[PDB]
Amino acid sequence: RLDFILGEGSKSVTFKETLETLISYGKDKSNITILDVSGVPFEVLSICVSLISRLIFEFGYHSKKIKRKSNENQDIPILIVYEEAHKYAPKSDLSKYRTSKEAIERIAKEGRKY
């Protein structure tokens, strides 16, 4: 079940290859990137959503740090869609979904600038 997070491919995957896979900048370029998290285990689903949400956020965060240096209008605006947004972001303070709550909230407060 955890081959996507702990397989042999996950060991040898490049950090660059992860971002272009999540954002669709790889060999096959697409505007929409469907992240089918149907078969992800529920005790792992919070972990995978939180990591992708953070990785996309610092992609936009680190883009603004070169944008001040580059001072040129070349932007990559990103919109993330959360079907079942109440699930990864509940108001309950129970420990099962805190990581996905913190990642989505970080895009909610600071993602507008980035």
């Binding site: 303070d93 420990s95 805190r98 600038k113």
Partner: protein, 114 residues
């Protein structure tokens, strides 16, 4: 209002020729609460009040007056309104951690959920 204590930043809505002064002696020392919706113009109203509080002087001197205004600018918008001001972002602010009290220092380092 006396002519010395008059502070004008707005005019009457149904009569633009009628200036509406406030007691600027009493306008500032007692706290101000500017409330509106997003897109109602409360950032402009804040900016216009502070510009009127800066360019005004006793006329017996040339230079900066004694206004001291601190803006907790969070949307990165008041840089344009006051070009001759001191702006402190993350890359320029140096806030010492040791000036934090015990309550602030707990939130910076500990976790409260566990």
């Amino acid at each position: 209002i006396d002519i010395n204590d008059r502070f004008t930043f707005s005019s009457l809505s149904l009569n633009t020729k009628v200036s509406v002064p406030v007691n600027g002696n009493r306008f500032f020392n007692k706290h101000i609460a500017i409330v509106g919706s997003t897109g109602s113009g409360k950032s402009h109203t804040v900016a216009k009040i502070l510009q009127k509080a800066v360019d005004e002087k006793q006329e017996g001197y040339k230079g900066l007056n004694n206004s001291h205004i601190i803006i907790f600018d969070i949307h990165s918008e008041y840089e344009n309104a006051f070009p001759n001001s001191n702006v402190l972002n993350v890359d320029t602010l140096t806030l010492p951690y040791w000036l934090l009290n015990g309550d602030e220092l707990e939130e910076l380092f500990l976790d409260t959920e566990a």
